[PDB]
Design a protein around this ligand. Structure first.
Ligand code: CLA
Ligand code: CLA
Ligand code: CLA
Ligand code: CLA
Ligand code: CLA
Ligand code: CLA
Ligand code: CLA
Ligand code: CLA
Ligand SMILES: CC1=C(/C=C/C(C)=C/C=C/C(C)=C/C=C/C=C(C)/C=C/C=C(C)/C=C/C2=C(C)CCCC2(C)C)C(C)(C)CCC1
Ligand SMILES: CC1=C(/C=C/C(C)=C/C=C/C(C)=C/C=C/C=C(C)/C=C/C=C(C)/C=C/C2=C(C)CCCC2(C)C)C(C)(C)CCC1
Ligand code: SF4
Ligand code: SF4
Lengths: 80, 141, 33, 42, 734, 107, 67, 153
């Protein structure tokens, strides 16, 4: 649906995942930062697009990055 | 981990509201959340109003994932209980959804793989002229 | 009958052709191959 | 008075004092030299 | 390609919501973003679409000609033009009441009719086209050209004639042919019309297709041209007494350069326009044979751009690599094209009022106002589009690695300087223009208009005095008889030009004053600020400090979330969208200025504008409140008049201009959470559970709703001002 | 015209002092305060002046009361949370005796 | 040998996508692991739009200023 | 007589405007007693009007057909007092302000948290910096020549 691609500037603070209201993101093991973890995005099909993940990303610009794309009923926040 | 195999557990005491499953459950997927409450207590359910979850196992069927995960975060932060919700399509095939490894997604469990992950800084993405007349975008190389 | 021609065409383009186009484009909007 | 001079040093209090003084200056100039459209003093 | 209605996009076809419908309507002509697209197929769709547009243009002109031929009083208008009303088309509205049929019957018609404020009567009468059968023939021929363009657009979509991508990228042969033939041979052919037809038509005889091979446009006939004695085509200039349409006071010349206006029509001479189109035909036919196509001579635009690198590097790498960022990029081509088109449309507007080409078009006052307003709003829109397509080029088509350090990348190198100095110029202009306008408002309020700051526009009065206007006593090159300019032209065109410009009644170089200064600086504020918004959105199209990855989000996207303080309206599309507001404001200023200056000239009291244009309650009282009386009285409780439709359209434009505020002020989230309640109610209302949508009814998208609010806003702006400017100028007619 | 505002003659704004009537050049007010003062039977500027000094006294009184009821001796939540007393007093005393004393003034 | 700048060295930024592009900063700490891609932690005087004054930068996305 | 404008001491419409405003004030002066305070204020306004029109007469203002003082801002010396002699007097004062507020910003640029001096202005430092901008043009000139006017990034 959407396209939540993340970048290697992530520091493993786990705030993008702790803000995500749809479990799009999840921390995985990684070796590119002091915290030794990075935030994957398997459940991109559940992404509403609220960009709470990148309103909580403490990088110079951003590491998690939501690119709005084809809108499905899960991505249009529809309970009907 | 093996999923938790959603049983026919009871539901909270709720007097009914206008926030339920209208048509996204009849023809499309709807969701269901299960939480083990140590005691019977009142909680603000995400469909408007206030329900009383029972002691032991509870089950609440909601219309979309954001309701389930909002309620789950409020449960885990306010009542400190362990929630886990599913997705049930109208033909069946209940899908285990929230933890997906037993542990919550903020913890770096091994086994889960890197999907949606670019090994570059955000400003090293090529321009749209590079990916023009191609099905790919500037963030999928 | 040339002062009667506006009476023929103003409904036929303004009422009838809009019904035709709205129906046809509503069917085209909801089609599924 | 300590910490009153810091409050009067704050941007709005200082701005209202500066612009009250300045506005009184302009007002009294326009009383003294009303209806001015040229600078004839060279 | 896809399944549901947006067959060109399987992302909107796989959208359960109603957004599918809207976005498939909107993105239909964005061929660059469609599925399975190639540069070849993009170019071919563009070519066929251009054919479709030309077909619709010729069809619309054929409709004008048919409805003036069938329902128009054009045969009666060519007898007494300046005292007979044009008729655009008839009207068959079955809602009309009998008073409205009594009222809309004008121009000596069998029934109710609409007054052609478009000027097609004057223009057609000036180029020949006397009887209604001529307009019928023209409509038939333009129907034929519409079918021809449709045939061409279908034919150049078939595989046997589908042109290749490298054929639309032949940027030398196309310029060669379009300068030589589209611009030169067409101006030459219009000279052929003006000489064989329109000049004989102005001088009596009706040279038509049956008898144009056996009449002489000049009594000698191609002796002067071949023998070089071209002065023989400027022998009898039908001097100062010619009645247009009759042979009284006529002449034999066909290309005399006279300058100035006809005395009767107060338009330009058809001999002048014939010689004009001939001259620019020679110039465009010469300029065509410049670019190398197939024959071993000419320039290559590459090695003109590649060669224009200044030593010292003040520009940088110069134009090294700019042929490729325009030839391969259709949005650069479109931006440059719309820039030139907006400039020359504004030029059309600014010259058609001051140098009217058509007979008795300066005498009908509503026509000139409608035309100037039309072409200026069109020009402002076309300019806004030029810039929007420059932004779309910078996002979609700009390749920085191909054009490193050249004259185009240097824009983005110092875009902050451009944006900040435009933000200085506009800020200066607004601060001081508004300060002076408010100073004058307060001076008139306090009953001391002598205290106003009435800055005379000496620098435009000096230019007027450099053109022969003897109304300021500057004694400049053409106002001074003892000068080189009033010696090398005093025998050719300065007689007519001086006798035209010195006439205070025409629109040629109107006598200006301090209100004209102040409103010209308001105009400068509008142009600079619209430019600021558009340039800032174009140069911040690829990215900024707040969103450096904007190029990855495309041209039109809503925002970048509430994070980083808040990123509402950050796209280059949003810059365009705000610049349409500032553009409509700018053209409203230029057209308010035009219409009030001209309605005060036409009424007679230029002193009204000169004493009332310097303070804004003069614009609100003496222009908007005063001239809108006959408009809003188009339908009163005790009757109605012919301006009832313009009162209704006035209020309609008000209503949609206000409805745009719903979409601009009120944003999404409130409406989705409203339509959720509506969907609940429909799914729980008895006898309407039977009926269920197939498209899930979501609220409008964000960028969509900015567009929809802008569309309501602009429709209301345009309709309101059209109604007011036509009703006020047609309620009294000067 | 009821007028209770005069402007200062500085930049030509003195023309806002209009011929409202009564040998007075000023701004015609619209607050209806003159009508209140005729309903109170004022009939003198001395009375308006002294009630202005009284309202300044009450402004200083309320400012001192706010200072006292925040910084020097402030109630706690048991004082605000009781509302039967607040209603009883605001009814019988504020609005009851207020209307009673206004009726006394009027009578 | 400790890689990168020092724990008080002044540095400027050559990262195009940063808020502090062509703006100087103070190196807080450099992660000596040769597996972290962005070890150079920089501290800046002025916050970005996210009200944050620091970010980890690469070695080649940084330039030791001569002041 | 530039731009086709008669001077204002010679313009009949200017004197007519004067007489019209004076009659408009006198018609409001009749309603008051000749010794009363509104009447005295109206008379002071009348003398202010009369000497205003006299001063616009004597200062070389040019009046148009509407009969209002127009400003010739082109550069003619006769009318420098309309735009250029005030304009310099603006660019001085304005350039005082910007040369002060800039200099202040350079003097509090080297603090630890220099933002708590933007909202809480150091009145001693600001008063020391304010008169530095008295003769600001030579400071700005020299700082342009010394390169201290433009930061080098
Ligand atoms: C784009 C060009 C254009 C436009 C805007 C109009 C506009 C109009 N036409 Mg005209 N018309 C046109 C081209 C156009 N016409 C052409 C090319 C033909 C020749 C086939 C006609 C023949 C025509 C007739 C015979 C009549 C109109 C009528 C009308 C009116 C109602 C619409 C119906 O028409 C029907 C549209 C067509 C036949 C066009 C098909 C192409 C409206 C004012 C009616 C009228 O006079 O109302 C007062 C009417 O009776 N039109
Ligand atoms: C209830 C209000 C109302 C309505 C419904 C009408 C209806 C009409 N008036 Mg109007 N009129 C009204 C009030 C109204 N009048 C009032 C109060 C006045 C003032 C006295 C007038 C003054 C007036 C004049 C002066 C004229 C009319 C004309 C007309 C006719 C237009 C011909 C037509 O259908 O062409 C087709 C319609 C259009 C091209 C306009 C629609 C444009 C659409 C919205 C934009 C395109 C959208 C998109 C591309 C297509 C989507 C639809 C698709 C499915 C087809 C029509 C019968 C004209 C007439 O009869 O001439 C033939 C005419 O000249 N009227
Ligand atoms: C930006 C546009 C603009 C412009 C150019 C003007 C210009 C003017 N207005 Mg208008 N006005 C404006 C906007 C504008 N106004 C607006 C927006 C409003 C509504 C708020 C008004 C309302 C208004 C009113 C109501 C009045 C004016 C008046 C005036 C005049 C001012 C005379 C005066 O007191 O200055 C005199 C000069 C000064 C106050 C500057 C003194 C500065 C100090 C003393 C320092 C200078 C000395 C310094 C140390 C350098 C010395 C050199 C060396 C020895 C060191 C002047 C023609 C007045 C007038 O005469 O009407 C024509 C008047 O009555 N204006
Ligand atoms: C001499 C040969 C020749 C000629 C006549 C044309 C003519 C044209 N080509 Mg071109 N073309 C040529 C050779 C030629 N081409 C070659 C060799 C190639 C291959 C390299 C192409 C490749 C090509 C492409 C790829 C496209 C065209 C297009 C067009 C059309 C332009 C659209 C239009 O109507 O503009 C009309 C504009 C003008 C006449 C210019 C007028 C501007 C003046 C300054 C305005 C002011 C005066 C005004 C006219 C007065 C109005 C008053 C009153 C009458 C209203 C036009 C029919 C486009 C098109 O529409 O496709 C169908 C298009 O997409 N052509
Ligand atoms: C493309 C434009 C065009 C076309 C098709 C024609 C075509 C024609 N002209 Mg015209 N003519 C034109 C432009 C044109 N002319 C221009 C621009 C001028 C001004 C210099 C003239 C001046 C002109 C004269 C003075 C005469 C013609 C004549 C002719 C005819 C014989 C040519 C041999 C022929 C019908 C001759 C003729 O027999 O008249 C019909 C004739 O006497 N033409
Ligand atoms: C020669 C003239 C010309 C041409 C060929 C184009 C062609 C194009 N424009 Mg441009 N444009 C123009 C004039 C032109 N425009 C003008 C005058 C303006 C200023 C108002 C704009 C403003 C503009 C913007 C702001 C955008 C485009 C976009 C586009 C593309 C897609 C069109 C679309 O989706 O909407 C088709 C439109 C409709 C189906 C109708 C919409 C309803 C409108 C409001 C009223 C009719 C297409 C390449 C878009 C783009 O590049 O895609 C990202 C885009 O975002 N154009
Ligand atoms: C009347 C309405 C209005 C006004 C005054 C402005 C004013 C401005 N707009 Mg526009 N704008 C408007 C409507 C308006 N806009 C609308 C409806 C839209 C569509 C969304 C836009 C969209 C828009 C964009 C997209 C851009 C602007 C820009 C600008 C600025 C242009 C520079 C200029 O002229 O500054 C001169 C200053 C003024 C005209 C301000 C007038 C106020 C006076 C002079 C100040 C003093 C008043 C008073 C003493 C304060 C005391 C009050 C209080 C403290 C008690 C300026 C602030 C551009 C910009 O800001 O860059 C420079 C820009 O990029 N505007
Ligand atoms: C500065 C000029 C000024 C002042 C001081 C007053 C003051 C007053 N007027 Mg007058 N009036 C004025 C201008 C002014 N008016 C104008 C221009 C008109 C139109 C002709 C009138 C017409 C008028 C009428 C018709 C009436 C009054 C009345 C009154 C009185 C009650 C209103 C009141 O307390 O305001 C309260 C208003 C507010 C609390 C609104 C907010 C205003 C804030 C506080 C302004 C802050 C400005 C600040 C210095 C600078 C910006 C601050 C910062 C945020 C950036 C009061 C004596 C009434 C009366 O009974 O008089 C006795 C009455 O009936 N006035
Ligand atoms: C964004 C962008 C874009 C767009 C842009 C635009 C839109 C622009 C515009 C522009 C414009 C719109 C311009 C205009 C200009 C003008 C000019 C530059 C002028 C000049 C003039 C002159 C030079 C003159 C001269 C003369 C005179 C004065 C008169 C008489 C004659 C003579 C000749 C002498 C593009 C695509 C490009 C690219 C990318 C980016
Ligand atoms: C206007 C004003 C003012 C003033 C006011 C006043 C002056 C008031 C007064 C008031 C008063 C002066 C009041 C009084 C009151 C009283 C009362 C309220 C009484 C009551 C009584 C009773 C209730 C009684 C009972 C009884 C009886 C019946 C008999 C015997 C026994 C007994 C005692 C038990 C001021 C300055 C503030 C300012 C503002 C405005
Ligand atoms: S919020 Fe940003 S830095 Fe933190 S874990 Fe998520 S992607 Fe990494
Ligand atoms: S946009 Fe919202 S739902 Fe999507 S990944 Fe970010 S936080 Fe999660």
């Amino acid at each position: 649906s959407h396209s939540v691609k993340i970048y290697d500037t992530c520091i493993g603070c786990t705030q993008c995942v702790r803000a995500c209201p749809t479990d799009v993101l999840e921390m995985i093991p990684w070796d590119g930062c002091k915290a030794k973890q990075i935030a994957s995005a398997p459940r991109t099909e559940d992404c509403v697009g609220c960009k709470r993940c990148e309103s909580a990303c403490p990088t110079d610009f951003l590491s998690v990055r939501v690119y709005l794309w084809h809108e499905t009923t899960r991505s249009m926040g529809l309970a009907y | 981990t093996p999923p938790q195999l959603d049983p026919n557990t009871p539901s909270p005491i709720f007097a009914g509201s206008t926030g339920g499953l209208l048509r996204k459950a009849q023809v499309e997927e709807f969701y269901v959340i299960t939480w083990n409450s140590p005691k019977e207590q009142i909680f603000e359910m995400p469909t408007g109003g206030a329900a009383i979850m029972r002691e032991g196992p509870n089950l609440l069927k909601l219309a979309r994932k954001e309701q389930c995960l909002a309620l789950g975060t409020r449960l885990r932060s306010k009542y400190k209980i362990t929630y886990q919700f599913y997705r049930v399509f109208p033909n069946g095939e209940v899908q285990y959804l929230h933890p997906k490894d037993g542990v919550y997604p903020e913890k770096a469990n091994p086994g889960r793989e890197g999907v949606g992950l670019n090994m570059r800084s955000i400003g090293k993405n090529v321009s749209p002229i590079e990916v023009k007349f191609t099905g790919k975008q500037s963030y999928d190389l | 009958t040339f002062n009667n021609l506006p009476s023929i065409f103003v409904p036929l383009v303004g009422l009838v052709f809009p019904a035709i186009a709205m129906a046809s484009l509503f069917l085209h909007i909801q089609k599924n191959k | 008075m300590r910490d009153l001079k810091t409050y009067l040093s704050v941007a709005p209090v200082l701005s209202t004092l500066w612009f009250g003084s300045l506005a009184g200056l302009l007002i009294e100039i326009n009383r003294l030299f009303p209806d001015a459209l040229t600078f004839p003093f060279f | 390609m896809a399944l549901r209605f947006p067959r060109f996009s399987q992302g909107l076809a796989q959208d359960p919501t109603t957004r599918r419908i809207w976005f498939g309507i909107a993105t239909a002509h964005d061929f660059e973003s469609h599925d399975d697209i190639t540069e070849e197929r993009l170019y071919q769709n563009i070519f066929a679409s251009h054919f479709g547009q030309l077909a619709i243009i010729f069809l619309w002109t054929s409709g004008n000609l048919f409805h003036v031929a069938w329902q128009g009083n054009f045969e009666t208008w060519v007898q007494d033009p300046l005292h007979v009303r044009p008729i655009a088309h008839a009207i068959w509205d079955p809602h009309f009441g009998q008073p409205a049929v009594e009222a809309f019957t004008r121009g000596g018609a069998l029934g109710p009719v609409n007054i052609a404020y478009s000027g097609v009567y004057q223009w057609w009468y000036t180029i020949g086209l006397r009887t209604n059968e001529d307009l019928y023939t023209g409509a038939l021929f333009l129907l034929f050209l519409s079918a021809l363009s449709l045939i061409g657009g279908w034919l150049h979509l078939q595989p046997k004639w589908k042109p290749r991508v490298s054929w639309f990228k032949n940027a030398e042969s196309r310029l060669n042919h379009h300068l030589s033939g589209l611009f030169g041979v067409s101006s030459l052919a219009w000279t052929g019309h003006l000489v064989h037809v329109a000049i004989p038509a102005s001088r009596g005889e009706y040279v038509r297709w049956n008898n144009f091979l056996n009449v002489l446009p000049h009594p000698q006939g191609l002796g002067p041209l071949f023998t070089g004695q071209w002065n023989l085509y400027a022998q009898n200039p039908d001097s100062s007494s010619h009645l247009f349409g009759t042979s009284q006071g006529s002449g034999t010349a066909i290309l005399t350069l006279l300058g100035g206006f006809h005395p009767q029509t107060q338009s330009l001479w058809l001999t002048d326009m014939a010689h004009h189109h001939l001259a620019i035909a020679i110039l465009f036919l010469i300029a065509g044979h410049m670019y190398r196509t197939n024959f071993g001579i000419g320039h290559s635009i590459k090695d003109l751009l590649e060669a224009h690198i200044p030593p010292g590097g003040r520009l940088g790498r110069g134009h090294k690599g700019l042929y490729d960022t325009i030839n391969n990029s259709i949005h650069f081509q479109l931006g440059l094209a719309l820039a030139s088109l907006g400039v020359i449309t504004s030029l059309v507007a600014q010259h058609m009022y001051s140098l009217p080409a058509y007979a008795f078009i300066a005498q009908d006052f509503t026509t000139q106002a409608a035309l100037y307003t039309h072409h200026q709003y069109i020009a402002g829109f076309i300019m806004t589009g030029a810039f929007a397509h420059g932004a779309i080029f910078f996002i979609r088509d700009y390749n920085p690695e191909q054009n490193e350090d050249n004259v185009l990348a240097r824009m983005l190198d110092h875009k902050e300087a451009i944006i900040s100095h435009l933000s200085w110029a506009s800020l200066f202009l607004g601060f001081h223009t508004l300060g002076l306008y408010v100073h004058n408002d307060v001076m008139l309020a306090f009953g001391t208009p002598e205290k106003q700051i009435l800055i005379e526009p000496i620098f435009a009065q000096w230019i007027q005095s450099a053109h022969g206007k003897t109304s300021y006593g500057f004694d400049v090159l053409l106002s001074s008889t003892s000068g080189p300019a009033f010696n090398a032209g005093r025998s050719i065109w300065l007689p007519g030009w001086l006798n035209a410009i010195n006439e205070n009644s025409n629109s040629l170089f109107l006598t200006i004053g301090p209100g004209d200064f102040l409103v010209h600086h308001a105009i400068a504020l509008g142009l600079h600020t619209t430019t600021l918004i558009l340039v800032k959105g174009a140069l911040d199209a690829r990215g900024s400090k707040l969103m450096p990855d904007k190029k990855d989000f495309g041209y039109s996207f809503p925002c970048d979330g509430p994070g980083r303080g808040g990123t509402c309206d950050i796209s280059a599309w949003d810059a365009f969208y705000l610049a349409v507001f500032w553009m409509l404001n700018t053209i409203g200023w230029v057209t308010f200025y035009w219409h009030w200056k001209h309605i005060t000239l036409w009424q007679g009291n230029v002193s009204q504008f000169n004493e009332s244009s310097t303070y804004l309650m003069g614009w609100l009282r003496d222009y908007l409140w005063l001239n809108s009386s006959q408009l809003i009285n188009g339908y009163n409780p005790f009757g109605m008049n012919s301006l009832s439709v313009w009162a209704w359209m006035f209020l309609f434009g008000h209503l949609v201009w206000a409805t745009g505020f719903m979409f601009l002020i009120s944003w999404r989230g409130y409406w989705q959470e409203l339509i959720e309640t509506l969907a609940w109610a429909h799914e729980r209302t008895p006898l309407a559970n039977l009926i269920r949508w197939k498209d899930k009814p979501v609220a409008l998208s964000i960028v969509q709703a900015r567009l929809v609010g802008l569309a309501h806003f602009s429709v209301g702006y345009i309709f309101t001002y059209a109604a007011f400017l036509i009703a006020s100028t047609s309620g009294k007619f000067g | 015209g009821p007028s209770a505002q005069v402007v200062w003659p500085i930049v030509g704004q003195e023309i806002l002092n209009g011929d409202v009537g009564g040998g007075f050049r000023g701004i015609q007010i619209t607050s209806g305060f003159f009508q209140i003062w005729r309903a109170s039977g004022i009939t003198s500027e001395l009375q308006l002046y002294c009630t202005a000094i009284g309202a300044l006294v009450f402004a200083a009184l309320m400012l001192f009361a706010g200072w006292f009821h925040y910084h020097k001796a402030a109630p706690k939540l048991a004082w605000f949370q009781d509302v039967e007393s607040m209603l009883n007093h605001h009814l019988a005393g504020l609005l009851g005796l207020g209307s009673l004393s206004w009726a006394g003034h009027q009578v | 040998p400790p890689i990168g700048p020092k724990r008080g060295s002044k540095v400027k930024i050559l990262r195009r996508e940063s808020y502090w592009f062509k703006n100087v900063g103070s190196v807080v700490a450099v992660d000596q692991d040769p597996k972290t891609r962005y070890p150079v932690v920089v501290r800046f005087a002025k916050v970005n739009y996210a009200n944050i004054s620091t970010n980890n930068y690469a070695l080649d996305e940084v330039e030791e200023v001569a002041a | 007589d530039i731009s086709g404008l008669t001077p204002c001491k010679d313009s009949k419409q200017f004197a007519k405007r004067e007489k019209q405003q004076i009659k408009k004030l006198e018609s409001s002066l009749k309603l008051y007693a000749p010794e009363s305070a509104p009447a005295l204020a109206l008379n002071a306004q009348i003398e202010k009007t009369k000497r205003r029109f006299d001063n616009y007469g004597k200062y070389g203002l040019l009046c148009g057909s509407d009969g209002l003082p127009h400003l010739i801002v082109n550069g003619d010396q006769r009318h420098w007092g309309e735009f250029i002699t005030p304009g310099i007097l603006f660019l001085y004062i304005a350039g005082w302000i910007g040369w002060v507020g800039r200099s202040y910003l350079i003097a509090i640029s080297g603090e630890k948290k220099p933002a708590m001096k933007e909202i809480i202005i150091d009145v001693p430092l600001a008063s020391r910096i304010i008169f530095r901008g008295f003769i600001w043009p030579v400071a700005a000139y020299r700082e342009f020549l010394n390169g201290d006017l433009i930061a080098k990034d």
